[PDB]
């Protein structure tokens, strides 16, 4: 069944949804960016989803109050139907069995109300009235319970996705959070960043490799001084050239590295924002999945309760003037039996609300 943790998880999801920023500049401050250049993750995209979550959270208390008040109402409705049904059965069973088996319900109602006057006329009229009132009462509880179930179902489908009772189809807030979360992961830079770090270190070692070979070749260029004048011309030309090839290649890589470190710095910036947004969407999504499970329980409970009321209503429709009174008592028992289940479930739900409210004090 729907438990107190289920109700607390709904309140926790609503509180998270209402705390989401919805103003565009606040969503941007929350994201840490004005543009990310990933489809579906731009601040306008995130705001649209936060607006939908916020509106859904705003709508919980209408459902919550309908659920709790309907449980309070069905509690005392079940109690009244069972006790009044039992009183009616007891009244009938005061008739001797030799008469009960052959007397029809119409004999103790309609056939007393067609002629002219009686005490049995008044009680027979009151018996006909209380049956009519109970029939209408059970129809009313079916109608209101169907509406509560519809509110819970629509609240659930808004979270899961699907077709609402209005016929509108909605994508589902939880699958939408999941899509964006998946886009953040398809967009991750961690491997790109690591391969760029690797190339900065490697070119930052080669820049140093022939700073030493520049110092070598320029030393080598002087080793014509052994011969003197034209041995220095040939050592100067050959090794002076190899020394500049090393310097030129060096200056291409110092420019290369400054670019690559600017690039990797921006890729790290994107990753940091992705990781932050991922964590927020994970928190939202966990709150949603717990709320969804809570609503699965609540929806199933209200479908089951509605089914019991409908069972009672169908049995009540079988009561008619031509039932022998022994058959009537058996059918009236079949009318009130489903209401034990309805009342037990309704009282259980009221008590879960009570225990969920008390949980705050027990924790703090």
Numbering used by the authors: 44 to 160, 163 to 409
Original paper wording:
YaxA and PaxB crystal structures were determined using single-wavelength anomalous dispersion (SAD) on selenomethionine-derivatized proteins. Because our PaxB model could be well resolved, missing merely the N-terminal 11 residues, we will utilize these coordinates for most structural analyses throughout the manuscript. All three proteins adopt similarly elongated, α-helical folds composed of a five-helix bundle head domain and a two-helix-coiled-coil stalk, tapering to a narrow turn in the case of YaxA, while connecting to an additional α-helical domain in the case of PaxB. For alignments of the YaxA head domain, Z-scores ranged from 9.6 (soluble-monomeric ClyA, 5.5 Å RMSD; PDB code 1QOY34) to 12.2 (NheA, 3.4 Å RMSD; PDB code 4K1P26). Looking at a series of conserved and solvent-exposed hydrophobic residues of the YaxA foot domain, we suspected this moiety to be a possible membrane insertion site. Replacing individual nonpolar residues in the YaxA foot to aspartic acid (V264, L266, F268, and I272, along helix α4) resulted in 2-fold to 3-fold weaker membrane association (lanes 7–10). Strikingly, a deletion mutant of most of this domain (Δ265–284; Fig. 6c, lane 11) did not co-sediment with membranes. Reflecting their impaired membrane binding, YaxA foot domain mutants showed reduced hemolytic activity, ranging from a 10-fold decrease in potency (V264D) to undetectable activity up to 2 µM (Δ265–284). YaxA, bearing a membrane-binding domain at the tip of its coiled-coil stalk, associates with the target membrane on its own. Uncharacteristic of PFTs, YaxA’s transmembrane moiety is fully solvent exposed in its monomeric state and becomes an integral part of the pore structure upon oligomerization with YaxB. For YaxA, rearrangements in the head domain remain modest compared with the monomeric protein (RMSD of 1.1 Å across 259 Cα pairs).
